[PDB]
Amino acid sequence: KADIAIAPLTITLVREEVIDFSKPFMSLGISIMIKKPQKSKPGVFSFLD
Amino acid sequence: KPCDTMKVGGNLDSKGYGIATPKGSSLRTPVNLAVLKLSEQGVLDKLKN
Amino acid sequence: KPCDTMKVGGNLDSKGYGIATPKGSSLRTPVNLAVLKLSEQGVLDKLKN
Amino acid sequence: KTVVVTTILESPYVMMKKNHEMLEGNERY
């Protein structure tokens, strides 16, 4: 259905077995995204901290 | 925005994105060479920035 | 030992180590195929471990 | 003749231009 894919498509062994990939145009890795750690509400008895 | 997310820790792996073509495509060699030309001339870093 | 160093962050790039031969060496093809055979038979993972 | 490129709407690799409805073909992204 398409002649070429130009996208953030990761070079993987299972894909390379059925399609061709150029050498990498971008280096990367899996990472963790978290919601930021906002400031906590001061707890009762936080005067002992 | 809203700047409420954050990347935490190092990357879990190392890999790369590649331009993909159907197995045996006529475009495979020219597009592999072009990616290397754009890599070597610093175009890929300018575009990420 | 003394276990006093530590790897921090992700990798800055992605690449590989290769067996090298003089340009045009007769050994190039057999050694490329042997590395792939040692890869596929799990020898390279056993040796790193 | 014209190469059909498959891609994905994934920011910031490919995004709809703010005025894409007024543009044609590749100029929409």
Side-chain angles (χ1 to χ4, degrees), chain A residues 1-38 40 42-49, chain B, chain C, chain D residues 2-17 20 22-29:
Chain A
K1 313 295 184 145
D3 303 305
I4 191 171
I6 303 173
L9 187 66
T10 305
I11 296 165
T12 71
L13 178 274
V14 293
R15 286 174 178 171
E16 192 109 0
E17 292 178 328
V18 297
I19 57 167
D20 286 331
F21 278 104
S22 68
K23 291 307 168 286
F25 65 81
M26 204 161 222
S27 294
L28 60 303
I30 295 160
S31 59
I32 303 163
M33 169 190 287
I34 61 167
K35 165 83 166 181
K36 282 183 176 180
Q38 262 164 3
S40 57
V44 167
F45 308 125
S46 71
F47 66 85
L48 305 164
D49 289 348
Chain B
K1 287 192 300 170
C3 306
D4 56 347
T5 67
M6 179 170 131
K7 175 185 194 215
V8 291
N11 289 346
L12 278 67
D13 64 355
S14 295
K15 54 196 160 198
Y17 290 154
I19 303 295
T21 45
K23 195 75 97 165
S25 162
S26 169
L27 289 174
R28 154 144 88 147
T29 311
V31 320
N32 186 61
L33 294 172
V35 163
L36 285 186
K37 190 165 180 185
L38 293 177
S39 173
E40 281 163 27
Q41 323 274 30
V43 168
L44 304 186
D45 301 311
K46 281 216 198 58
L47 253 30
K48 186 184 203 197
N49 277 337
Chain C
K1 287 191 303 176
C3 304
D4 55 348
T5 67
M6 179 173 134
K7 175 179 187 219
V8 290
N11 289 346
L12 278 68
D13 65 354
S14 297
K15 54 199 162 195
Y17 290 153
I19 302 296
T21 46
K23 194 75 97 166
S25 163
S26 168
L27 289 174
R28 153 142 93 145
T29 310
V31 319
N32 186 62
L33 295 171
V35 164
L36 287 185
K37 189 204 187 170
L38 293 177
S39 172
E40 284 167 18
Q41 318 278 28
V43 169
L44 304 187
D45 306 308
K46 280 211 196 58
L47 253 31
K48 187 184 203 194
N49 278 338
Chain D
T2 291
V3 174
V4 169
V5 179
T6 183
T7 191
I8 188 167
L9 276 180
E10 183 71 277
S11 304
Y13 307 92
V14 176
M15 308 178 272
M16 302 306 280
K17 276 192 194 163
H20 66 89
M22 298 164 250
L23 305 175
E24 300 286 309
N26 298 338
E27 305 297 319
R28 292 170 290 171
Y29 312 102

